PDB file of N, CA and C in Angstrom:
ATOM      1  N   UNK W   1      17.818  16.073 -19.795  1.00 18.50           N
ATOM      2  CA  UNK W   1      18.507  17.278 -20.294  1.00 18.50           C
ATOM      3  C   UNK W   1      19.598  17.662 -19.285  1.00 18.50           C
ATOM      4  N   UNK W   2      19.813  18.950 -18.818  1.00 18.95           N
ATOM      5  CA  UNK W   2      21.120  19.566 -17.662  1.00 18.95           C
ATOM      6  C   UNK W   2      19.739  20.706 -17.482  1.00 18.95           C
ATOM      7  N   UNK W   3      19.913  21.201 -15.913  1.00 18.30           N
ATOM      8  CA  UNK W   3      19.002  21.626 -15.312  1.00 18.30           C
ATOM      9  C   UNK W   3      19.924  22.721 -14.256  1.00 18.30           C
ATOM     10  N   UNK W   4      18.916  23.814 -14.158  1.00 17.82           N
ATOM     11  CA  UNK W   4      18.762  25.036 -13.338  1.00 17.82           C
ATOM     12  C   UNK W   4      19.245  24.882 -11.784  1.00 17.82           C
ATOM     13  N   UNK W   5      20.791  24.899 -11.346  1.00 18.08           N
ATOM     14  CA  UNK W   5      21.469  24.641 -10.411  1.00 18.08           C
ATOM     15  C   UNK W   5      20.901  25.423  -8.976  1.00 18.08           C
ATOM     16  N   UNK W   6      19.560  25.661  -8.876  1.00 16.86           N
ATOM     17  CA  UNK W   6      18.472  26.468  -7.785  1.00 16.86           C
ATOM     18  C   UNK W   6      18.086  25.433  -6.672  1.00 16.86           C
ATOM     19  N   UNK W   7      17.848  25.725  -5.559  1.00 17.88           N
ATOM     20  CA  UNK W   7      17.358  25.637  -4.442  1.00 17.88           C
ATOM     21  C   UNK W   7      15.726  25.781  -4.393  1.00 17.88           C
ATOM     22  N   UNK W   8      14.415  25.368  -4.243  1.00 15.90           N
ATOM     23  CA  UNK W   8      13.875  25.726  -3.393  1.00 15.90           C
ATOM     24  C   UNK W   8      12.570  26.526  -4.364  1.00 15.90           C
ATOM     25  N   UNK W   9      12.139  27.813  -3.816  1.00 15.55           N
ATOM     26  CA  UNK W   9      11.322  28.897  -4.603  1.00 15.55           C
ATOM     27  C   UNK W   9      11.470  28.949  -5.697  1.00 15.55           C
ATOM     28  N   UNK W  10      13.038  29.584  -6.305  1.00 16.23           N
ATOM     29  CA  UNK W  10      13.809  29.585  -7.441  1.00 16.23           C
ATOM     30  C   UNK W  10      13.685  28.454  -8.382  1.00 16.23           C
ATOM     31  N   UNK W  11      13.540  27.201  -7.840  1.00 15.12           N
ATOM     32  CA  UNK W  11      13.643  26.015  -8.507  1.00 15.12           C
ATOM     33  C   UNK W  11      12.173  25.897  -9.278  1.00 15.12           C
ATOM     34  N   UNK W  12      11.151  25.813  -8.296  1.00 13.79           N
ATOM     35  CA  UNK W  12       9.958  25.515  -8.888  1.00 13.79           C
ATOM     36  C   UNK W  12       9.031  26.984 -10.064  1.00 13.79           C
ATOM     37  N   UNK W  13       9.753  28.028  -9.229  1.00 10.93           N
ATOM     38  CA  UNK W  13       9.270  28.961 -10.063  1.00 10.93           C
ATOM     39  C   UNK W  13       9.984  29.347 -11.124  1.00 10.93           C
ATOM     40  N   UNK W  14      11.113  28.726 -11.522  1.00 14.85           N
ATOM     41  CA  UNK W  14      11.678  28.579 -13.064  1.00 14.85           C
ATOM     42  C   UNK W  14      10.937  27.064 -13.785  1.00 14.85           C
ATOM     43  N   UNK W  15      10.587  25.855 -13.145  1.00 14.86           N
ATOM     44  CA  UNK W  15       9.732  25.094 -13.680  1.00 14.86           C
ATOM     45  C   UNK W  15       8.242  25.519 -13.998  1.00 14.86           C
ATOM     46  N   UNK W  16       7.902  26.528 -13.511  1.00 15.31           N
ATOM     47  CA  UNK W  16       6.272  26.887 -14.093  1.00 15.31           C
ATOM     48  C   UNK W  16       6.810  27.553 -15.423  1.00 15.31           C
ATOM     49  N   UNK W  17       7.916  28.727 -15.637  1.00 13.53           N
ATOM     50  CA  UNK W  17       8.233  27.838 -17.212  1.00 13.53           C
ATOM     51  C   UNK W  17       9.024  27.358 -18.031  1.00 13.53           C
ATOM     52  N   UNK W  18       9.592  26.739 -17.643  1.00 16.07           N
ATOM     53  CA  UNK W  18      10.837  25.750 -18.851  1.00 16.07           C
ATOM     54  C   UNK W  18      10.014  24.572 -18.891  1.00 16.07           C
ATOM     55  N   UNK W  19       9.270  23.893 -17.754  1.00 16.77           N
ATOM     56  CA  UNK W  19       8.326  22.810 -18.299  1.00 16.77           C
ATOM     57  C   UNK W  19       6.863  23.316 -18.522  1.00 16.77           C
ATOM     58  N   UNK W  20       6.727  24.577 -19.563  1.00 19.19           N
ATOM     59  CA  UNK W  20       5.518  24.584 -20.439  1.00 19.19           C
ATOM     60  C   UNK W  20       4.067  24.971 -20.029  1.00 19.19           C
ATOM     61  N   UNK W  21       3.931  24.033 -19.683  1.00 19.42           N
ATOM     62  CA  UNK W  21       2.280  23.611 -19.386  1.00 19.42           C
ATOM     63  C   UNK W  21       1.749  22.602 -17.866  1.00 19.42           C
ATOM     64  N   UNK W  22       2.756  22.330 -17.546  1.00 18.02           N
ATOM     65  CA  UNK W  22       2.610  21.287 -15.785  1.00 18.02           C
ATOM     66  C   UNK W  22       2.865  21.957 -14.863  1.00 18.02           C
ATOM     67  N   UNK W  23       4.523  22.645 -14.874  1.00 17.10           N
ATOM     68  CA  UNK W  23       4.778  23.369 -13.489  1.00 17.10           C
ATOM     69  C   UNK W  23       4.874  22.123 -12.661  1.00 17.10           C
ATOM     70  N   UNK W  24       4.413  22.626 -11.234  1.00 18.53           N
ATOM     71  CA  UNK W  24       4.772  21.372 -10.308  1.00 18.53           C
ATOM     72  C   UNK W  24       4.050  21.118  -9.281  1.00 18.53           C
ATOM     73  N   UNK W  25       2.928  20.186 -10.074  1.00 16.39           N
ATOM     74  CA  UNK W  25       1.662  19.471  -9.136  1.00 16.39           C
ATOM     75  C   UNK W  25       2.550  18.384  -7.845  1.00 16.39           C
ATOM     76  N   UNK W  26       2.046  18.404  -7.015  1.00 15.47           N
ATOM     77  CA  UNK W  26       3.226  17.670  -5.714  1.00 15.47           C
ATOM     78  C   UNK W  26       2.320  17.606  -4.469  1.00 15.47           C
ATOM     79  N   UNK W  27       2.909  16.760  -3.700  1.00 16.77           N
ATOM     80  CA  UNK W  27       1.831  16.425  -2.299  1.00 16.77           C
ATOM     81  C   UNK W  27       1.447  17.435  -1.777  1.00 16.77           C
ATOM     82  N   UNK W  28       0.216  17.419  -0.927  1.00 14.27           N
ATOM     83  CA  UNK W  28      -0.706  18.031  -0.339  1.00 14.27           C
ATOM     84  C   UNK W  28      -0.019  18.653   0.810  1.00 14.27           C
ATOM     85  N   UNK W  29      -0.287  19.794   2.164  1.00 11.77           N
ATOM     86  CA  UNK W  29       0.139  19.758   3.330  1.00 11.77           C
ATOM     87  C   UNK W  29      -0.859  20.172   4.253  1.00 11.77           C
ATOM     88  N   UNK W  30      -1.701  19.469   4.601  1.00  9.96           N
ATOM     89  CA  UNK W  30      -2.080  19.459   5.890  1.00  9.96           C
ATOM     90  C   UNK W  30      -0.736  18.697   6.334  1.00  9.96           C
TER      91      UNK W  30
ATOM     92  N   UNK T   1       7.304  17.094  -2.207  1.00  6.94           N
ATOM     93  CA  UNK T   1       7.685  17.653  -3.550  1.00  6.94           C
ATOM     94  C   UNK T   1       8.836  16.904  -3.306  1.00  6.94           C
ATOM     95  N   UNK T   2       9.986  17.097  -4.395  1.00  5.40           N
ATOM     96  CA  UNK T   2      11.197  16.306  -4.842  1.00  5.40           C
ATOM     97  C   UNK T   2      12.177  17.400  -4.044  1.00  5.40           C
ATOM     98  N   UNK T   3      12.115  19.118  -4.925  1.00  2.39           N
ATOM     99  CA  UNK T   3      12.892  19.849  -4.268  1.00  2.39           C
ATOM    100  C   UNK T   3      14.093  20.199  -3.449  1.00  2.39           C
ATOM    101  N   UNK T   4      13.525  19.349  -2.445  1.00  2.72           N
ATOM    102  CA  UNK T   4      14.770  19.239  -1.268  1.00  2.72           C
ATOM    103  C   UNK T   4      15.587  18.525  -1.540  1.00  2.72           C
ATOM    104  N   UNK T   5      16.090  17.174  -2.388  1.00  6.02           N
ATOM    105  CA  UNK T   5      16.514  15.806  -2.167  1.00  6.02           C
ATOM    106  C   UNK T   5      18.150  16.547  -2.576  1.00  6.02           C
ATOM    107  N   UNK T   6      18.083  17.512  -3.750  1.00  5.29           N
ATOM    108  CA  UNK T   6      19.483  18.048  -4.643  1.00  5.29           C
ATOM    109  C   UNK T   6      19.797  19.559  -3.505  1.00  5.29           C
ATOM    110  N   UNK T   7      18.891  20.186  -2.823  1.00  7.16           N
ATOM    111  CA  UNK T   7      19.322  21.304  -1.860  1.00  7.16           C
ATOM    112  C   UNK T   7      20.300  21.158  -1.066  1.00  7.16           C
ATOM    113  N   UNK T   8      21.439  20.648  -0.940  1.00  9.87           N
ATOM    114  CA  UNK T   8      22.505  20.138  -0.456  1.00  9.87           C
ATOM    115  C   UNK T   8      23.555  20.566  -0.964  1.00  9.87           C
ATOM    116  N   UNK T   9      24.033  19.702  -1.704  1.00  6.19           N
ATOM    117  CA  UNK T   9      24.972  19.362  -2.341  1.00  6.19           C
ATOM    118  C   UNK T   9      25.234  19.354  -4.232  1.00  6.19           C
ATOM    119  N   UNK T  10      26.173  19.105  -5.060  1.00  2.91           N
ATOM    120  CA  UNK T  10      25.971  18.435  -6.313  1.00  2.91           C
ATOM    121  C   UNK T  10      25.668  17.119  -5.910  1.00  2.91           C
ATOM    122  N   UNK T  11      24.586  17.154  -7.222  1.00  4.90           N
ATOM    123  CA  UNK T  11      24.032  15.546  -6.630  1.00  4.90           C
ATOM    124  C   UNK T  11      24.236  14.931  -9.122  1.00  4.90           C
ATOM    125  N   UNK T  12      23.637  14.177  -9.211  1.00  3.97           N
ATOM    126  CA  UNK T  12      22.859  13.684 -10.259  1.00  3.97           C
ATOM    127  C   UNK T  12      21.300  14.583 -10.086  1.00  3.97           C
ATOM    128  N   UNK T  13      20.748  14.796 -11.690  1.00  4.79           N
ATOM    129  CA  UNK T  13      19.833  15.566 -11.515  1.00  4.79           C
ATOM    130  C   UNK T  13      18.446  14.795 -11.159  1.00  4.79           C
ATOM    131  N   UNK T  14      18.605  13.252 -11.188  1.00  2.00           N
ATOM    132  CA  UNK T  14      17.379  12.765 -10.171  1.00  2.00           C
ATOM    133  C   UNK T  14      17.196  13.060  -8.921  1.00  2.00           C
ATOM    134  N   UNK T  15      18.169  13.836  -8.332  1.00  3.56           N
ATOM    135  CA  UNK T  15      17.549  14.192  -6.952  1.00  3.56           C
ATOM    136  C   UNK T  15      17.564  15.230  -6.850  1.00  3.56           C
ATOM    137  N   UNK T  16      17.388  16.067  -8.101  1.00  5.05           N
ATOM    138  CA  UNK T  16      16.841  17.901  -8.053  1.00  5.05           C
ATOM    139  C   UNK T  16      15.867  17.995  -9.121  1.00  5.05           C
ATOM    140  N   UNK T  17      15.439  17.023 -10.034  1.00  5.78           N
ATOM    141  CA  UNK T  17      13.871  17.122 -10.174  1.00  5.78           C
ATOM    142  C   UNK T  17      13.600  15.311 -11.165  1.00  5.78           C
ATOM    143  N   UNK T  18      12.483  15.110 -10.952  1.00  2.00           N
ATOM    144  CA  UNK T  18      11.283  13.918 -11.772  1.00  2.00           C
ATOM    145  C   UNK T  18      10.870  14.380 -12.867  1.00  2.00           C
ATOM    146  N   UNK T  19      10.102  15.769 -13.258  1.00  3.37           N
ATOM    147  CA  UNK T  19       9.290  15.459 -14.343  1.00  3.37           C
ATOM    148  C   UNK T  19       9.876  16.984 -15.498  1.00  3.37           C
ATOM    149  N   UNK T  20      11.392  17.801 -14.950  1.00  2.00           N
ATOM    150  CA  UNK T  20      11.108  18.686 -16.408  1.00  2.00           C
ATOM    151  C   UNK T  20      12.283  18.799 -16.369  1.00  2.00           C
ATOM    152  N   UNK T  21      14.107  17.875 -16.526  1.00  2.00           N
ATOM    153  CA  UNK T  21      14.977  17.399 -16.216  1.00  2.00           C
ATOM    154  C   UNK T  21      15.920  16.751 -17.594  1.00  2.00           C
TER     155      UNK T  21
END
């Protein structure tokens, strides 16, 4: 598609929702 | 996470996200 020109916080917390139901499972940090 | 790779610059949107793009 064309996507949300964000940085960072902004970025992932507009993916919890424009992608629905996933959001953004991603590596661990210890 | 992917995140960082597009925090730069204009890039292509494979290096500002993988899975909702």
């Amino acid at each position: 598609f064309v996507n949300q020109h964000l940085c960072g916080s902004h970025l992932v917390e507009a993916l919890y929702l424009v992608c629905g139901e996933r959001g953004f499972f991603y590596t661990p940090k210890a | 996470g992917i995140v960082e790779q597009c925090c730069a610059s204009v890039c292509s949107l494979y290096q500002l996200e993988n899975y909702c793009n």
